[PDB]
C-alpha cells in the first residue's frame, strides 16, 4: 500500500504487513531485525516519521512487485516452449526431484 | 607404577576363573594386587526377522555380550609378567596387558 507493494493491512504489526503480499517474507525476520529496527512495536499501525527511515533501504534490494511473477512466467514459457522433459511431469504434479504420485487427488490436477 | 589388564570373553564363568587364576599367580610371588575391578559391561543389539519370505513383524532378538574386566597390579616385576603369561587355556579372554 502506502509503504510499498499492493495493499497493506491497517492497524496491524509490521512483521505480518511486510509478508501479507509478495515481499520480504517472515523467514528473513532475524536478518531484517539485525539490519533494520522497524518491527512490531505493538499490534497496531504505529508508522511514524522515525519508522520507515531505513527499513525501506534494508528491504530495497528485495524488489518484489512483479519480479517473482516474471521469473515464474519466463520459466514456464521456457518449459512449454523448449522440449518439456520437465513440462511433461509438470502436468502430473511431479517436481524436478520427483514425487512418485499415487494419491492424485483433485488439488493440483483436474 | 602399575600394570593393568583388560579381559573380554563372552562367558562370565571363564572370565571369573581367568581373573582368579591371574590374581593368584600374580600374588604368589608378590603382593599388593588390586582386585577384579568391575566395568559396566555394555551389550549389543541384533534384531533378526523370524521368517524368510514374509512376516516382518515377527522378529527375533540377538545381541553380543561385551564383558570388560580390569585387574591392576602395582610395583611391577618380571615375576608377575611370567605369572600373567603362564597359561591362558580359556583363551576366550583377550589378555591386553598395559602399564
Amino acid at each position: 500500500a502506502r509503504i510499498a507493494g499492493v495493499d497493506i493491512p491497517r492497524e496491524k504489526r509490521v512483521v505480518i504487513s511486510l509478508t501479507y503480499i509478495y515481499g520480504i517474507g517472515t523467514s528473513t525476520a532475524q536478518k531484517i531485525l539485525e539490519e533494520a529496527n522497524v518491527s512490531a512495536d505493538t499490534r497496531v499501525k504505529d508508522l511514524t516519521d522515525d519508522e520507515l527511515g531505513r527499513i525501506r533501504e534494508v528491504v530495497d534490494g528485495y524488489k518484489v512487485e512483479g519480479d517473482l511473477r516474471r521469473e515464474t512466467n519466463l520459466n514456464i514459457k521456457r518449459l512449454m516452449e523448449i522440449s518439456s522433459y520437465r513440462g511433461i511431469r509438470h502436468r502430473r504434479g511431479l517436481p524436478v526431484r520427483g514425487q512418485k504420485t499415487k494419491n492424485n487427488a483433485r488439488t493440483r490436477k483436474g | 607404577q602399575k600394570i593393568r589388564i583388560r579381559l573380554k570373553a563372552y562367558d562370565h564363568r571363564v572370565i571369573d576363573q581367568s581373573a582368579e587364576k591371574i590374581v593368584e599367580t600374580a600374588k604368589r610371588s608378590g603382593a599388593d594386587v588390586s582386585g577384579p575391578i568391575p566395568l559396566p559391561t555394555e551389550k549389543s543389539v541384533y534384531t533378526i526377522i523370524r521368517a524368510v519370505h514374509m512376516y516382518k513383524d515377527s522378529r527375533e532378538q540377538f545381541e553380543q555380550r561385551t564383558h570388560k574386566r580390569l585387574i591392576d597390579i602395582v610395583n611391577p616385576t618380571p615375576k608377575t609378567v611370567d605369572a600373567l603369561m603362564g597359561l591362558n587355556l580359556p583363551s576366550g579372554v583377550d589378555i591386553e596387558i598395559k602399564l
Binding site: - | 573380554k8 570373553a9 563372552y10 591362558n88 583363551s91 576366550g92 583377550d94
Partner: protein, 204 residues
C-alpha cells in the same frame, strides 16, 4: 516357528559353543575361515560319521576335537593318516592345526550318529519303520531318559509329505535343565529330501 531347535537355547547356559575363539571386531575373518573347515569335515564325516567338532583358537594355534564313531582308523594303525589330514587342513585354512581325536561316548546313544545311521539306512532302501524300531530298542537298552526321532517328506517311495514320531520316556523340552542333543540329517534315494531330527535326553 512353533518348534525351534532347543540346543540353540541350551547353549550359553549349561553347554559350550560349537566354535570358540578370542573376541575381536575381526569376527568375519574367523567365521569365514571356520566355515571352510566345517565344510571340509564332510570328508571324515562320510567314512567315520563324526558327530561334531569343537574348534579352539589359541594365541596362534588352532585346537580341534572330533567325535568320531570309531577311533581305530581315524587315528590309523600307528598314525598313518592323521598327518596328511593335518597337512591338508593346514593348506586349506592357510594356518596350522592341532588335531586331538577323541572317540564319541562308547554307547551309540548320541544324536548325530544315529541320525546319520538312519539316514543312510533309508537311503539304502530299508523300511524306515523297522529301522526306527531297532533304533529305539537299542536306545532304551543302552539307557536314556528320553529319545524321539521325527521324519518328514516322501517316505517309502510315495508322493505325499507325511511325518511320524516315535518317542519313549519322559522328555522335558520346555524344561531347561535337560542337557539334550538335537541333531539333523538328510536322506533320499530318488525322491526329493527326507529330513530327520533325532532327540536325546540323557541326564538332568
Amino acid at each position: 516357528g512353533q518348534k525351534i531347535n532347543p540346543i540353540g537355547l541350551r547353549v550359553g547356559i549349561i553347554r559350550d559353543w560349537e566354535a570358540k575363539w578370542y573376541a575381536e571386531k575381526d569376527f568375519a575373518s574367523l567365521l569365514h575361515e571356520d566355515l571352510k573347515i566345517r565344510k571340509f569335515i564332510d570328508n571324515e564325516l562320510k567314512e567315520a560319521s563324526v558327530s561334531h567338532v569343537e574348534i579352539e583358537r589359541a594365541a596362534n594355534r588352532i585346537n580341534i576335537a572330533i567325535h568320531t564313531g570309531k577311533p581305530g582308523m581315524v587315528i590309523g594303525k600307528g598314525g598313518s593318516e592323521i598327518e596328511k589330514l593335518r597337512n591338508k587342513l593346514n593348506a586349506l585354512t592357510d594356518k596350522k592345526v592341532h588335531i586331538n581325536v577323541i572317540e564319541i561316548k562308547k554307547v551309540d546313544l548320541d544324536a548325530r550318529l544315529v541320525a546319520e545311521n538312519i539316514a543312510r539306512q533309508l537311503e539304502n532302501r530299508a523300511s524306515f519303520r523297522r529301522v526306527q524300531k531297532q533304533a529305539i530298542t537299542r536306545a532304551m537298552k543302552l539307557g536314556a531318559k528320553g529319545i524321539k526321532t521325527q521324519v518328514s517328506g516322501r517316505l517309502g517311495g510315495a508322493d505325499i509329505a507325511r511325518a511320524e514320531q516315535y518317542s519313549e520316556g519322559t522328555v522335558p523340552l520346555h524344561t531347561l535343565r535337560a542337557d539334550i542333543d538335537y541333531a539333523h540329517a538328510e536322506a533320499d534315494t530318488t525322491y526329493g529330501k527326507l529330513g530327520v531330527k533325532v532327540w536325546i535326553y540323557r541326564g538332568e
